Amino acid sequence: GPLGSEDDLYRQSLEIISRYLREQATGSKDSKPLGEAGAAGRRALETLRRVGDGVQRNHETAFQGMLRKLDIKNEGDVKSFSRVMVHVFKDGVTNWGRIVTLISFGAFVAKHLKSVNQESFIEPLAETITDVLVRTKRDWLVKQRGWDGFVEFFHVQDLEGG
C-alpha cells in the first residue's frame, strides 16, 4: 500500500548482509563502502565482522562443530536453517547479540560453502537469512533504528571521532 508497506531497512539489511557473507566467504577484508546501504552500514559492517569472526574463533569447536553437522547439500537444508533461527528466537527475546550470531553462523556456512565452491547455495542462504532475520522482528528493527541502533548498542562507549 502506502509508505507503511515500504521497507528501507530491508534494502539496507540485504545490502549489508549479502555483502558481508560474500566478503567473509571469500576472505575479502576489503568490501565496497556501505554508500548504497547507509552511513551506519560501515560501522555495522566492521562491528558485525569483528564480533562474528571473534565468536567463531572464541568458540572454534562449538561453531566449527555445529557447522560440520549442518552441511548444505540441497534446498532442503534451507528449511532446517530457518528452524535453527527460530530455535534461537524461541523465547521471543529480540537482542542484537542473537542477530550477530545468526548472521555469523550464516557467514560460517557461506565460508564453508565457498570452500567447496557451493556459491549456488550461498546467495539464496544470504537472502533467506536476511528476510527471515529481519521479517521475524522487523518491528524491533524499527524501534532500534536498524543498524544505527546495532552499532549504538554494540558500541556504547565508542570514541567516534577517532
Binding site: 564480533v51 530455535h87 534461537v88 524461541k90 547479540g97 542473537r98 550470531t101 545468526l102 562507549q157
Partner: peptide, 27 residues
C-alpha cells in the same frame, strides 16, 4: 530428529545471550 537442532539453536543462544548481556546491563 530434533535434538541436534535443539543443541545447535541453544548453542547460538548461549553464546548470543551472554554476548548481548555484556552491553545490555554494563555500559
Amino acid at each position: 530428529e530434533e535434538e541436534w537442532a535443539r543443541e545447535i539453536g541453544a548453542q547460538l543462544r548461549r553464546i548470543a545471550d551472554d554476548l548481548n548481556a555484556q552491553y545490555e546491563r554494563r555500559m
